[PDB]
Amino acid sequence: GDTRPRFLWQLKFECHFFNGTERVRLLERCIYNQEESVRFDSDVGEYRAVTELGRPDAEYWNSQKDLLEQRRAAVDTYCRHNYGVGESFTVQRRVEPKVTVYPSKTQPLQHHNLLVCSVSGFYPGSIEVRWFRNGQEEKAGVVSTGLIQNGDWTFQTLVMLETVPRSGEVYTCQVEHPSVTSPLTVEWRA
Amino acid sequence: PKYVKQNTLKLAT
Amino acid sequence: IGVGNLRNFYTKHDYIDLKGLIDKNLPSANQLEFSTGINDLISESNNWDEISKFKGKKLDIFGIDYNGPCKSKYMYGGATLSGQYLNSARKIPINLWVNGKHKTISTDKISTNKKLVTAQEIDVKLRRYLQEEYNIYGHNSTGKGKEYGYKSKFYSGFNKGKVLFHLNDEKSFSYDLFYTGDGVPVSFLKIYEDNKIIESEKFHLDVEISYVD
Amino acid sequence: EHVIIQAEFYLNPDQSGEFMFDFDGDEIFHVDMAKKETVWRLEEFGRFASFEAQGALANIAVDKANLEIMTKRSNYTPITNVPPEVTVLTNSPVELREPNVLICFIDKFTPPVVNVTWLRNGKPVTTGVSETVFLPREDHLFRKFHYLPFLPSTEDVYDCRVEHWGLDEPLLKHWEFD
Ligand SMILES: [Zn+2]
Structure with a gap:
């Protein structure tokens, strides 16, 4: 087999945006074998060694004045630029959650039923999922998946309520998400 | 509308 | 004309x-x-x-x-x-594609110390720079841009191009760099009659120049 | 509020590199180094934006040469293998004979080299499969997703088999609809 040692070099140019493009930070990072050696951070305004191995590079690059000028202008020509180019399909991407309620295929809690609210296929990741019993929110006996990234520009989340279903009861899962003006609701009747 | 990359730089020798 | x-x-x-x-x-x-x-x-x-x-x-x-x-x-x-002035002039950050090849420009030749500046001022300065460096409109005073040739109606290497004002938090807009109108300045300069003002700190330029055969 | 990362790597002796853009954890695009072209994560992205692929290839050339500089400067210190965590899940609830997609999520590993195989009932499956490139993490390890469209049935058993140097044996991760 091939058990030869490996050597890895990673580069990351990161544009961090706060309040749209109002405040921007560019962080350029060099990473050797998973350890960052040198970086340019726009809040500092020059290269700085992160480990002793990147010290020659900070010193070299800091002496190139055209290079530092380009990197300082890069918060506009690169970060704010790319933000703008992709805005419509990234920042403003809105995909509506598909919401279902189902009782669990397991009911392992004797007469305590488990109700699942599945919220799938949505973008962006900001979401609120609330369970109601007879129009009153249920906070206790709730268990969650948290946010799941599918890797295809959609999220999903599953929120499970334990309850003892009594007849007449109306259970409601309520989803609020940026893709919708008013809450999405799915009703389940005991 | 065109994506812009940052140039990777040659290390100190 | x-x-x-x-x-x-x-x-x-x-x-x-x-x-x-x-x-x-x-x-x-x-x-x-x-x-x-x-x-x-x-x-x-x-x-x-x-x-x-x-x-x-x-x-x-x-x-x-x-x-x-x-x-x-x-x-x-x-x-x-x-x-209403900035502490020092702001070099307008610029992406420029020449025949499709990208570079970043930062120059005192395209800059302003005005908090609020007209799209005209910036576009004039851009154009005087591009003429000096790339001989865009032909017969420049610098002799630079030798390498692009003389095939266009302008006796230059370019007959297509736009300047996009890429604004941070307003709708972006672009001017055609080779627009002549009915031929006279009172016609092609009319693009400027809106007196469009931009916040000088809150934008950059994405500029393209090329040649269509 | 938002983060856009242009992330590249070069790896020796495998002599493999990648160039991608990430928006808030999702891939915008990568460059196909073989075909010299921009590949959008969702095709519709390509209707609204462009990227000049050759710029990725130029950056990779510099990355390759720099890796060689660092390999020597460090006195040939190699990477420590970090094994992947593997998760199999679906993208939405599973309904009998309603098309769905199995996700094999590979996480927290380095170096970025893996061999991933989907198996249905012991047998390898390739129909309709796809995968992401190696995606960044803030700890500088990698993520990757593999996908298998499938038709849910009670009788099928799937495995996502993952091979990585950090692992003591190939990782087989089971999934069935019960
Ligand atoms: Zn721009």
């Missing part, structure tokens, strides 16, 4: 660049007028909502007189309220 007039009016004639002129507050809703000494200049526009705020006030003017030498001085737009 559009070719010689585009070249000349943008790149050969001195632009107007005056600070602290006081508009005369005359009836017209399409014109501002200021003393410049012994003569007066008139800035024409088609944007009363904008211009009404500049009437009677201390303004800074910058752009191109569309009448040229020997006539009275008239221009389009180019006005901003005086008295």
Whole structure:
């Protein structure tokens, strides 16, 4: 087999945006074998060694004045630029959650039923999922998946309520998400 | 509308 | 005639660049007028909502007189309220594609110390820079741009191009860099009659120049 | 509020590199180094934006040469293998004979080299499969997603088999619809 040692070099140019493009930070990072050696951070305004191995590079690059000028202008020509180019399909991407309620295929809690609210296929990741019993929110006996990234520009989340279903009861899962003006609701009747 | 990359730089020798 | 007039009016004639002129507050809703000494200049526009705020006030003017030498001085737009300046001039950050090859530009030759600046001022400066460096409109004064040839109507290497003003938090807009109108400056400079002002710190330029056979 | 990362790597002796853009954890695009072209994560992205692929290839050339500089400067210190965590899940609830997609999520590993196989009932499956490139993490390890469209049935058993140097044996991760 091939058990030869490996050597890895990673580069990351990161544009961090706060309040749209109002405040921007560019962080350029060099990473050797998973350890960052040198970086340019726009809040500092020059290269700085992160480990002793990147010290020659900070010193070299800091002496190139055209290079530092380009990197300082890069918060506009690169970060704010790319933000703008992709805005419509990234920042403003809105995909509506598909919401279902189902009782669990397991009911392992004797007469305590488990109700699942599945919220799938949505973008962006900001979401609120609330369970109601007879129009009153249920906070206790709730268990969650948290946010799941599918890797295809959609999220999903599953929120499970334990309850003892009594007849007449109306259970409601309520989803609020940026893709919708008013809450999405799915009703389940005991 | 065109994506812009940052140039990777040659290390100190 | 559009070719010689585009070249000349943008790149050969001195632009107007005056600070602290006081508009005369005359009836017209399409014109501002200021003393410049012994003569007066008139800035024409088609944007009363904008211009009404500049009437009677201390303004800074910058752009191109569309009448040229020997006539009275008239221009389009180019006005901003005086008295609001940055600590030092801001080099406008620029992405430029030349025939499709990208580079970043940062130069005092395209810069402003105005908190609020006209799209015209920036676009004039850009164009004078591109002419000097890439001989965009032909027959420049620098001899640079030798390598792009002379095939276009301009006797240059380019006959296509746009400047996009890529604004941070307003809708972006672009001007055609090789537009001639009906051929005379009073026609192709009319793009500037809106007196479009931008926050000088809150944008960058994405500029393309090329040649279509 | 938002983060856009342009992330590249070069790896020796495998002599493999990648160039991608990430928006808030999702891939915008990568460059196909073989075909010299921009590949959008969702095709519709390509209708609204462009990227000049050759710029990725130029950056990779510099990355390759720099890796060689660092390999020597460090006195040939190699990477420590970090094994992947593997998760199999679906993208939405599973309904009998309603098309769905199995996700094999590979996480927290380095170096970026893996061999991933989907198996249905012991047998390898390739129909309709796809995968992401190696995606960044803030700890500089990698993520990757593999996908298998499938028709849910009670009788099928799937495995996502993952091979990585950090692992003591190939990782087989089971999934069935019950
Ligand atoms: Zn831009």
